């Protein structure tokens, strides 16, 4: 039975599923973001003060790995939660018509902002488009870091490399990747707040994008 299939779909991802997500975003998530932001800024301070020598190319700084993993963990929960909201809307996109699409436009509008969050802000795709990646740092931040650092480490170890700037770059890779996290957290917070507001103002039409007024005909 076809109506029963749809109904099972919608019963399983209700408006309280998506509201649940938004409550967490206004309380828990924004606070964990800000905490990551302070940890990353604090780790930046440490590194701005350090002078770097070959000593530093023999050890991956566990403070920075810490910050970076913590951030990847948040982006993971935010992506999974965004997708709950997206599911709740996508399964309520009604029959395709060339009319009565005032609600369907609200749906496509909000789904688009969730796309922006997931694809662009969280930078979650394999290859980002020709839109670039506008976010300072992706989900796969830890990997980008280790990779950028481990090339610099090879060159500095091996007769190492006698480039004085290459030594400073190792430091700059640590500094910049902590900055990139401060920045990315700020930007993520705006986007998370933007979505909270988009959702709360529009939820009624996200669930019921049409009303069936039959009062003119008999």
């Amino acid at each position: 039975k076809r109506a029963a299939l749809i109904q099972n779909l919608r019963d399983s991802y209700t408006e309280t599923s998506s509201f649940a997500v938004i409550e967490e975003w206004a309380a828990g998530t924004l606070q964990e973001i800000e905490g990551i932001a302070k940890a990353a800024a604090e780790a930046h301070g440490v590194i701005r003060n350090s002078t770097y020598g070959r000593a530093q190319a023999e050890k991956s700084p566990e403070q920075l790995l810490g910050v970076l993993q913590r951030y990847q963990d948040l982006c993971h929960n935010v992506y999974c939660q965004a997708e709950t909201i997206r599911t709740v809307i996508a399964i309520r996109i009604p029959e395709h018509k060339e009319e009565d699409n005032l609600g369907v436009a609200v749906q496509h509008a909000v789904l688009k902002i969730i796309d922006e969050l997931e694809i662009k802000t969280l930078g979650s795709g394999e290859k980002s488009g020709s839109g670039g990646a506008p976010t300072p740092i992706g989900m796969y931040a830890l990997r980008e870091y280790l990779s950028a650092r481990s090339t610099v480490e090879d060159k500095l170890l091996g007769g190492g490399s006698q480039s004085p700037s290459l030594l400073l770059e190792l430091r700059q890779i640590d500094a910049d990747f902590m900055l990139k996290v401060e920045l990315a957290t700020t930007h993520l917070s705006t986007m998370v707040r933007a979505v909270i507001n988009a959702y709360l103002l529009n939820w009624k039409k996200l669930i019921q994008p049409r009303t069936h007024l039959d009062v003119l005909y008999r």
Binding site: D214, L216, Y217, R218
Partner: protein, 227 residues
């Protein structure tokens, strides 16, 4: 596209705005009429909407005169304006000639008005279908009429959402010249045929007229005995 104005043919020779006007007709509740032995009848579904609406208020079978009745389906405001036009048009015929000899011509006058609004820009078609049933100097007559201004004379027909279920069902069961009491049963069966999955059929309206007589509206006590 070629569907934004009543005066514009598509390249295949279609007036899409007229076809859409016809979709308004499908949103009305089902109604049917059929000819029987020396008579004709109308039946129409009553989808009760609330305790708070008066029942003997807008029900759908309307006498045009004592010997002619009509059911409508589609936009209710437009149905009203067309029934009231039909009524006036019947009285004009009666004042000119002292009697409505052929009902086909009352229908034709109404259909003409409807067609006229599918040729001039600056007006929209009437979103209504009608069934006309009555007796005249030819015999019992059953007609229908659509937004386009199209006429057909039927032995049995339906209009409304459940049109197809009902026309399909009469296509198999209908017999000419039943007695009144059996035609009414056959009608009710047709109507029941059109609902989905063990859904209730509450009291419809039934009106009938037989040669030599005036129209009679069944009251809901008499109508119940067929449920």
């Amino acid at each position: 596209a070629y569907d934004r104005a009543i005066t514009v043919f598509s390249p295949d020779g279609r007036l899409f705005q007229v076809e859409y006007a016809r979709e308004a007709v499908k949103k009305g509740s089902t109604a049917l009429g059929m000819k029987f032995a020396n008579g004709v009848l109308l039946i129409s579904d009553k989808k009760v909407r609330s305790r708070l609406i008066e029942q003997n208020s807008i029900e759908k079978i309307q006498l045009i005169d004592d010997y002619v009745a009509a059911v409508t389906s589609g936009l209710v405001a437009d149905a009203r304006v067309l029934v009231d036009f039909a009524r006036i048009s019947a009285q004009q015929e009666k004042v000119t000639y002292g009697s409505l000899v052929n009902i086909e011509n009352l229908v034709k006058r109404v259909a003409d008005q409807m067609q006229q609004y599918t040729q001039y820009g600056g007006v929209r078609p009437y979103g209504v279908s009608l069934i006309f049933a009555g007796i005249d100097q030819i015999g019992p007559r059953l007609f229908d009429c659509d937004p386009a201004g199209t006429i057909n004379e039927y032995k049995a027909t339906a209009i409304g959402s459940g049109k197809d279920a009902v026309v399909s069902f009469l296509e198999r069961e209908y017999k000419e010249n039943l007695p009144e009491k059996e035609a009414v049963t056959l009608g009710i069966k047709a109507l029941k045929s059109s609902l989905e999955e063990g859904e209730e059929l509450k009291a419809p309206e039934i009106a009938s007229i037989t040669v030599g007589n005036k129209y009679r509206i069944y009251d809901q006590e008499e109508v119940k005995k067929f449920l």
